[PDB]
Design an enzyme around this catalytic site. Structure first.
Site, short mmCIF file in Angstrom:
data_model
loop_
_atom_site.label_atom_id
_atom_site.label_comp_id
_atom_site.label_asym_id
_atom_site.label_seq_id
_atom_site.Cartn_x
_atom_site.Cartn_y
_atom_site.Cartn_z
N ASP A 167 0.81 -1.22 0.00
CA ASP A 167 0.00 0.00 0.00
C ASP A 167 0.85 1.27 0.00
O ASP A 167 0.44 2.28 -0.59
CB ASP A 167 -0.96 -0.01 1.20
CG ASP A 167 -2.06 1.06 1.11
OD1 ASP A 167 -2.81 1.25 2.10
OD2 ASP A 167 -2.18 1.72 0.06
N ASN A 402 4.22 -9.79 6.14
CA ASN A 402 3.01 -8.99 6.31
C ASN A 402 2.03 -9.37 5.21
O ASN A 402 2.28 -9.10 4.03
CB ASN A 402 3.26 -7.48 6.29
CG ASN A 402 1.97 -6.68 6.54
OD1 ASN A 402 1.49 -6.57 7.67
ND2 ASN A 402 1.41 -6.13 5.47
N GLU A 403 0.91 -9.96 5.60
CA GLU A 403 -0.18 -10.30 4.70
C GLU A 403 0.28 -11.12 3.48
O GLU A 403 0.00 -10.74 2.34
CB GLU A 403 -0.90 -9.04 4.25
CG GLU A 403 -1.61 -8.32 5.37
CD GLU A 403 -2.43 -7.14 4.87
OE1 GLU A 403 -2.22 -6.72 3.71
OE2 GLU A 403 -3.29 -6.65 5.62
N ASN A 457 -4.75 -8.85 10.71
CA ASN A 457 -5.13 -7.56 10.13
C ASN A 457 -6.59 -7.68 9.72
O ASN A 457 -6.90 -8.35 8.73
CB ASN A 457 -4.25 -7.22 8.92
CG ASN A 457 -2.78 -7.00 9.29
OD1 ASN A 457 -2.38 -7.07 10.46
ND2 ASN A 457 -1.97 -6.73 8.28
N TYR A 459 -10.54 -5.73 9.17
CA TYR A 459 -11.23 -4.49 8.82
C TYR A 459 -12.72 -4.73 8.69
O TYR A 459 -13.36 -4.28 7.73
CB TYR A 459 -10.66 -3.90 7.54
CG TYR A 459 -9.26 -3.38 7.71
CD1 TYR A 459 -9.03 -2.15 8.32
CD2 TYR A 459 -8.16 -4.11 7.26
CE1 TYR A 459 -7.74 -1.65 8.47
CE2 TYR A 459 -6.87 -3.63 7.41
CZ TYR A 459 -6.67 -2.40 8.02
OH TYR A 459 -5.39 -1.93 8.17
N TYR A 463 -13.41 -2.29 5.11
CA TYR A 463 -13.36 -2.93 3.79
C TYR A 463 -14.45 -3.97 3.61
O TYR A 463 -14.83 -4.27 2.48
CB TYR A 463 -12.00 -3.60 3.55
CG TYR A 463 -10.86 -2.64 3.46
CD1 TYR A 463 -10.86 -1.63 2.51
CD2 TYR A 463 -9.77 -2.74 4.31
CE1 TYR A 463 -9.80 -0.73 2.41
CE2 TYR A 463 -8.71 -1.86 4.23
CZ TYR A 463 -8.73 -0.86 3.28
OH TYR A 463 -7.67 0.03 3.19
N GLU A 497 -3.49 -4.87 12.63
CA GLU A 497 -4.11 -3.79 11.88
C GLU A 497 -5.61 -3.82 12.09
O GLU A 497 -6.21 -4.89 12.23
CB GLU A 497 -3.82 -3.85 10.37
CG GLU A 497 -2.37 -3.66 10.04
CD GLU A 497 -2.12 -3.49 8.58
OE1 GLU A 497 -3.08 -3.14 7.86
OE2 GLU A 497 -0.96 -3.70 8.18
N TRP A 542 -3.98 0.33 13.13
CA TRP A 542 -3.44 0.95 11.92
C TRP A 542 -4.05 2.33 11.75
O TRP A 542 -5.27 2.44 11.62
CB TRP A 542 -3.75 0.09 10.71
CG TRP A 542 -2.93 0.36 9.51
CD1 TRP A 542 -3.36 0.88 8.32
CD2 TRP A 542 -1.54 0.09 9.35
NE1 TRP A 542 -2.31 0.94 7.43
CE2 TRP A 542 -1.18 0.47 8.04
CE3 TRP A 542 -0.55 -0.43 10.20
CZ2 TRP A 542 0.12 0.34 7.56
CZ3 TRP A 542 0.74 -0.55 9.72
CH2 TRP A 542 1.06 -0.17 8.41
N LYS A 561 -5.87 6.55 7.85
CA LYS A 561 -6.22 5.82 9.05
C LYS A 561 -5.38 6.24 10.26
O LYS A 561 -5.45 5.60 11.31
CB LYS A 561 -6.10 4.31 8.79
CG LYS A 561 -6.98 3.79 7.63
CD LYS A 561 -7.25 2.28 7.77
CE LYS A 561 -8.19 1.72 6.68
NZ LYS A 561 -7.68 1.84 5.27
#
Ligand SMILES: [Mg+2]
Ligand SMILES: [Mg+2]
Ligand SMILES: [Mg+2]
Ligand SMILES: [Mg+2]
Lengths: 591, 297, 591
Positions: A167, A402-403, A457, A459, A463, A497, A542, A561
């Site tokens: 990102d 990460n992810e 993470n 959301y 999202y 996150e 995050w 954010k």
């Protein structure tokens, strides 16, 4: 090479240290002709460029901000006559993303990876009591075999553009202090520590690695009082009534490592260490044998103007803000940070989850033909990160990816050697984790079983199922957490996150996504989910502050954010977290 | 030259408010607009009455929006068409005597590549011809996924109306020149299928917040919006058949919640409180400089 | 003292240079007890503080931000064994506002004035091949005998608070790089240059001041080619086909100054100079014999977080912005800036009006009993500023006061020796000015007759006759300008301040004060006045960027007259100025 060392550069009895930060010269190289054309001997045309900084946000035109390819830094440094007989070594905190270093036109180092340090030995290349030319050929192109991962694209006019799989904006340049060192030819290259608490104090088991045969002594000072000493490249420092390093209650001792030839000191290294133990037992993060509920941030090395450049005033302000808000922990998303940030965490008593730039790993990603090459770079980054950071009391855990697309076929073949390496490299055997993508579920993730604690993470309400339907998001979230409860088998889970984009000053009653109200409503729902489950042992939101991303319709001048603005002032959510984090006891969430 | 609008304001939703209406016309006069479309529904009569007095041209639009197996293969299509015919009949009967009303827009962004498009469009465009004693031109606005060579509906239009976002939804960012070439590519297609017909743009623009400045630009900044508009208008100005530009939108307006919508839609040339954004000054200079009969054919 | 030198520190054949910037220790001293209590030997308690920075904006509490009184900085520095026999000297770019420096507990320097450099010789105080303690006792209290002027007040709880007579926030701390130097005991202390254009090139008359008897040579290099050389502490460098330094077209030569004992080099100083002439003739600013219409800014050393701390990334960005907008000139309002900003102006071809911190001088102000003491500090600041800055090609004029009460009785007795000193100190005899308060009119100002060109700060349409009545402001403005036309007698006049507060994004149609529209309307009216008068030869608008002031109902988080935001992005007025300044020819306003 044989003298590899990731120790922070120090002025000592035997080591000289000269910073080279300042205004350098700089040139883009769009035709990649500099080496053949002789640019290492002089840049034909150049512009002034401050070091340390990302180059991108200093310019007023977008082609320079988005420049992707080869670019050159150049400066001059003086080597005193009286350094003759010392080793002459250049240290780069980092060069993003890769570098070829020339001194007086001759190549002396190559480095891959934009977030960890490397040295160039120039003892036999420099002219003594003269000026010397330092040229750095750097490159910021992205590929699927590097950390972080992405690709590059070609625009209509032929300019390369970076296309990250991540990102954050592809800031490049020379982000960290550069150093000129005079070092003894026989010297300390590394040391390690392990800690143990006893009834009357503490013990530190150490090793020291030198590149020679002469004896080693190690001493520990509390102020001017020596509290421990030991001869040998291995041993134990016994510290009676040790003052322990603790969250928000740091205590550091002065470490003196010396090499001797007879009665002469041939090398001396100096550092500061904290006496603390950290381990997962009984499904809790135990610091000095007491549980800690982690609260804090995913961060970025990001600020106005300078990109990822190190800025000690911003660093000080950020710690003052993290102390004010009641954080005790942050993750170095998504790359190892400048050493100076860990040094400050060491002094302020903050806990760090240290993360390698294994982000963007998203046929499955781990079936690609290029995976063996990627793993090689991942192992190197992991090795360098753990070697650089292992003696910080603040550093208590390693985040290895990460992810990643950890539902991909080939995940296990990729993860298994990485998590084994992280165990082998760390003398303190600190817990290992990686952050789980939203599309990797308790029952489909092939990677979660490798983690010593799970990092999510999530959301739910941004999202996924955002808007008027906040209660649908809450139930979907509880649904997935019931799955995680089944696969964890005693392990702590933390959130690394969560959050919503919201602009400073956007108020609406009733809320809309992007408003302060929505963010507060989302956080209250999210924390109620967290608080429901005894295995949730940490919340890292995050992000600490608004930060820059690539352009897109989803990104209102970068990522919004932040709990603080990019200029380091609070948004309304900072007050929600301050009340919560300073109200929750340090050992919240009995297990 | 002018706007797609909305009946939208703070507090009152779509409620009629004559002070807002007066202010909006004062703003449209100030900026040099001569035209707007009643996106995406017929407006309160009072707005046409004011257009009648201020000498503004209106493209009158029925609420045939959201028509996006293909949409026009659904079993429910005959029922939809019945309601569409009724709305069209009532709109033309209500509005036919306004001097300001000069054209009918029969659909906004229908899936006009869908099978069944022709069976749906043909009776609608015939009805619009029959109902209007003045036989004013008929149009509908074309989705971005309906291309010159794939649109089954464009042949029914007396003039083509495009909603295009080259440089925002498609190829946005550092790659503004890729967007420009893709845009020219599609326009060369429209040049081949128009056969003398005027083409106008009924939507284009970028979300940008009042006060968001960045040098160099990023999407969502005033700079980006100005850069996008200058590129877009250079495309417009290249083609003799482009005979109108109605930008999206006159003012920031409310949408449903979503991660793409920073408290509604932010493509306004004016804020929702009816003050100019930086793009209002670009359009004012352009629209008052272009002669009334710009683009000789 | 006897070895006073304001030369920028340099690494050379004979000089060593080590930067000491970084994290220091810091303590407030509210009871002013540190000296007696032994704090110079160690601070009993301290916090980490980055240097360079203002201390104020790093904290989260207002008592620390507004702290007024004594405060301490502390660090350690290593002196190599192999520096024995060299002079050991510490350089402070600045300490705001005054400083007492201790090394290993012994006082070694005192300095008054927060914006100019000073040295501390520590040759016989340091321990060699050991660490040494550097303690700085600084103070930021304001009085009527210092530059800048103000007072302090006591709050109810007994805390001192600063009460400036000036608009800008009382940022204090250590704002500029600190240096550790090894210098030959016989060395260059100063040099001066004067320039003259000839038919075949140029000539540079130089002097060199050393503290000893050994001979001096001076050489001028264009790259690796020596273009001139001369023996003696005075002489002339003849540069055939000299490449002249010009606005936006800088050219710099490398200057080498050496002291010799026989064939050995005992000292070497290195600098870069530009060959250019600047003078007022025929009522025009003549640069290399061609007129220049000045356009640009009053600036500040001000940014988020760091206060007045030097930040090379911000400096680079600011010059990129000033180049983008078409500026050719700025004034160092209201204090001399860090040397690095002039060095960049030297390279980018920008013109600087160099200003001493004589601001806040507003019975009349110049009748006060304390005036002789104030004048003494003013003379010292002026002397140091001209000595430090006289060899910059960018520096073309001296501003001796900002908005003094020059209608006060005693103005002439104060101004006359100051303007005489500025003439005597400058080998290049560059024009002298001071900025005129709005209450000092053509017919009442007792000071204007001393100025070589008049500089006005005028706010017709903001502070005076603002609002719907913009046309009344225009006529009042023309009225005063007709007065200035009568008293100028050929002299150029420039504007050094004008503008309106306006927030980024505040739009209103029709305008209101504080909106972008109003600012644009005010600027268009103001420039129409400027353009009416042949004697107006420069416009420097207030201010380059939003900056911090003390709190007040008139100040919406500081001053909002920036052409750019404090984060260095354009406001709408930046586009008005860019079109105007890049459209006006360089020699606009024939006379
Ligand atoms: Mg990110
Ligand atoms: Mg030892
Ligand atoms: Mg001021
Ligand atoms: Mg010489």
């Amino acid at each position: 090479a044989m003298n590899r060392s990731l120790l922070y550069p120090r002025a000592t009895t035997t080591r000289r240290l000269i910073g080279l930060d300042g205004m350098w010269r700089f040139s883009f190289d769009p035709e990649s002709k500099g080496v053949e054309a002789g640019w290492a001997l002089d840049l034909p045309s150049s512009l002034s460029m401050p070091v340390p900084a990302s180059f991108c946000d200093l310019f007023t035109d977008k082609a320079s901000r988005e420049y992707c390819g080869d670019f050159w830094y150049e400066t001059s440094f003086f080597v005193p006559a009286e350094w003759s007989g010392w080793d002459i070594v250049l240290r780069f905190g980092s060069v993003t993303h890769r570098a070829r270093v020339f001194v007086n036109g001759v190549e002396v180092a190559q480095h891959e990876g934009g977030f960890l340090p490397f040295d160039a030995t120039v003892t036999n290349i420099v002219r003594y009591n003269q000026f010397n030319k330092l040229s750095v050929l750097a490159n910021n192109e992205l590929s699927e075999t590097m950390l972080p991962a992405g690709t590059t694209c070609t625009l209509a006019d032929g300019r390369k553009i970076a296309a990250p799989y991540f990102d954050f904006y592809n800031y490049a340049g020379i982000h960290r202090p550069v150093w000129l060192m005079a070092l003894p030819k026989e010297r300390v290259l590394d040391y390690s520590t392990r800690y143990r608490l006893t009834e009357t104090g503490a013990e530190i088991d150490y090793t020291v690695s030198t590149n020679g045969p002469h004896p080693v002594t190690v001493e520990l000072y509390d102020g001017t009082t020596r509290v421990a000493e030991s001869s040998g490249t291995t041993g134990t420092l016994v510290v009676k009534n040790a003052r322990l390093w603790n969250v928000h209650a740091a205590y550091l001792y002065d470490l003196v490592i010396r090499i001797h030839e007879g009665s002469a000191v041939v090398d001396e290294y100096l550092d500061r260490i904290g006496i603390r133990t950290f381990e997962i037992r009984h499904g809790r993060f135990l610091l000095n044998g007491s549980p800690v509920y982690l609260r804090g941030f995913g961060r970025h090395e990001d600020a106005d103007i300078r990109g990822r450049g190190l800025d000690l005033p911003t660093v000080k302000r950020d710690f003052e803000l993290m102390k004010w808000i009641g954080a005790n922990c942050f993750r170095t998303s998504h790359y190892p940070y400048a050493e100076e940030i860990y040094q400050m965490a060491d002094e302020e008593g903050f806990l760090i989850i240290d993360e390698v730039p294994a982000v963007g790993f998203m046929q499955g990603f781990f079936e690609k033909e290029t995976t063996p090459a990627l793993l090689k770079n991942h192992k190197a980054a992991l090795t360098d990160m753990i070697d650089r950071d292992k003696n910080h009391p603040s550093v208590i855990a390693w985040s290895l990816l990460n992810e990643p697309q950890c539902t991909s076929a080939g995940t296990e073949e990729y993860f298994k050697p990485l998590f084994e390496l992280a165990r082998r490299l760390d003398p303190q055997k600190r817990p290992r984790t990686y952050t789980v993508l939203m599309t990797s579920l308790p029952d489909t993730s092939k990677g979660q079983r490798f983690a010593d604690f799970v990092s999510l993470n999530r959301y739910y309400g941004w999202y996924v199922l955002g808007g008027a339907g906040l209660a649908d998001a809450e139930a979907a979230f509880h649904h997935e957490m019931d799955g995680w409860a089944k696969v964890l088998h005693g392990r702590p889970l933390i959130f690394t996150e969560y959050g919503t984009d919201n602009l400073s000053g956007a108020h609406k009653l009733p809320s809309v996504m992007w408003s302060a109200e929505y963010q507060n409503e989302y956080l209250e729902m999210t924390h109620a989910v967290f608080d429901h489950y005894d295995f949730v042992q940490g919340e890292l939101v995050w992000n600490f502050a608004d930060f820059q991303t690539t352009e897109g319709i989803l990104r209102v001048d970068g990522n919004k954010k932040g709990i603080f603005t990019r200029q380091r002032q609070p948004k309304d959510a900072a007050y929600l977290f301050r009340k919560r984090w300073t109200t929750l006891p340090v050992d919240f969430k009995k297990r």
